[PDB]
């Protein structure tokens, strides 16, 4: 059986994020540019700060004609105490794509499948829909309310941006 | 239930690729130096282009007894339409080597296993095998015809060079 | 079926590592520094080399209330002519984390699950214990020795540290 999971990720601009690494002689994007990055991480229905996004693009090539880039992405999605899922695939800033879920841990033990990735921003709101398979149990209820509608303004509640104890998840990573 | 995938990944040096980033205090490759890459991908039977393979290779160390170097890998291997594949192990430049099949997306969700890794010129002609498991379906058989017999001497099909309809499939990664 | 294995990671400071990438505006570990590493592997008994450690640690952020770091890390552990394990997620220098199993090659194809991380000495002295499903076969008996207890005193066996052939596995990794 799949699970559907989805969160929104945010960068709310006070975690360095992202650095970039700017190895490539073009002023444009090129191969050998890196930008490890963290941003924050929200349920889909926006209620509760569940965490943050960890890892590492690698700019694969700018694409003139969609007025965009690709890359080759690396990271981690952490959930506090239910433990984190892992992640590899495309990141592409003109559409849509699927990115493989390498494994988890905690609750995300033994987790594969895959993820969609949406953007809504560039680059600071992404929704993100996992299908997971080979969890051990069903998903604990305050991850899986309906989610917001996706769009560009999008916000998370005021409670989990304040980080109120009605707005986390418990020891939510930061 | 194992299902062998065979492609060839070539470098035709259209791609900036490899950037290499050189840290390493060695006049060697040595650790500390980052390679980014990004290669076409063509069938096993060398009459289309699928795609791309895309990600980093990270130098472990030099090996002089061997005359070459031990890279650590993390990559993807895009299949257009058909979705992707991703792996992680070892890329040794003097022997041949096998990696994990950390997952996929597309035809590919839920792949396990590991591939075989040979190269036949160094650094522009590549050949793997894939033995997959946890795929949902027979692969297409767009992506399985008889592969060509690895050597140094094998060449894509110079339609598929051209990138002529009949030499690609639809949508192939670029 | 879960088949527990477990290692010891130790830095003799004989391979460069790690190799610190600085590009984080602070004296302190900050985002954009990135860290390859390949560290000595031994046996949970201590009575073998099987291999080495290979990756890279992408740093995230300080953590100053921690007094540590957290890193993201996607790195393989080789055992010689067994093959290799490969893994993703958090590397804490404050405390005990969880990574995901991604993949395996050799006898560890199909490996996955979750490996606990415990530091012992840091950074030169770490402790690992795979949960690992999947495998084919029961792991070998001199890779399942029942461990030496984690503690900062641990050291290999000297046959081990001098790499005769009692203290070490066919080819191990170097
Ligand atoms: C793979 C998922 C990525 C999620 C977004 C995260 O931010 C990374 C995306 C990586 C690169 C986007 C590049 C955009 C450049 C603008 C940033 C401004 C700056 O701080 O210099
Ligand atoms: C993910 C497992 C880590 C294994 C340990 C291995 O050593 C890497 C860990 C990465 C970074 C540790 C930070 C070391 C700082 C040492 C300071 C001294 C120096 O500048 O060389």
Do not use: W
């Amino acid at each position: 059986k799949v699970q559907e999971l989805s969160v929104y990720e945010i960068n709310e601009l006070d975690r360095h994020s992202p650095k970039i690494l700017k190895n490539a002689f073009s002023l444009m994007f090129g191969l050998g540019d890196l930008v490890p990055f963290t941003n924050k991480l929200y349920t889909g229905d926006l209620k509760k700060r569940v965490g943050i996004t960890a890892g590492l693009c690698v700019v694969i090539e700018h694409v003139p004609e969609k007025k965009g880039e690709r890359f080759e992405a690396t990271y981690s999605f952490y959930f506090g105490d239910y433990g984190h899922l892992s992640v590899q695939g495309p990141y592409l800033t003109y559409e849509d794509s699927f990115l493989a879920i390498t494994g988890g841990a905690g609750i995300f033990e033994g987790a594969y499948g895959q993820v969609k990735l949406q953007q809504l921003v560039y680059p600071t709101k992404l929704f993100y829909t996992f299908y997971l398979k080979g969890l051990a149990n069903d998903l604990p209820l305050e991850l899986t309310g309906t989610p917001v509608p996706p769009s560009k303004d999008i916000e998370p509640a005021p409670e989990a941006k304040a980080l109120e104890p009605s707005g986390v998840i418990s020891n939510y990573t930061n």
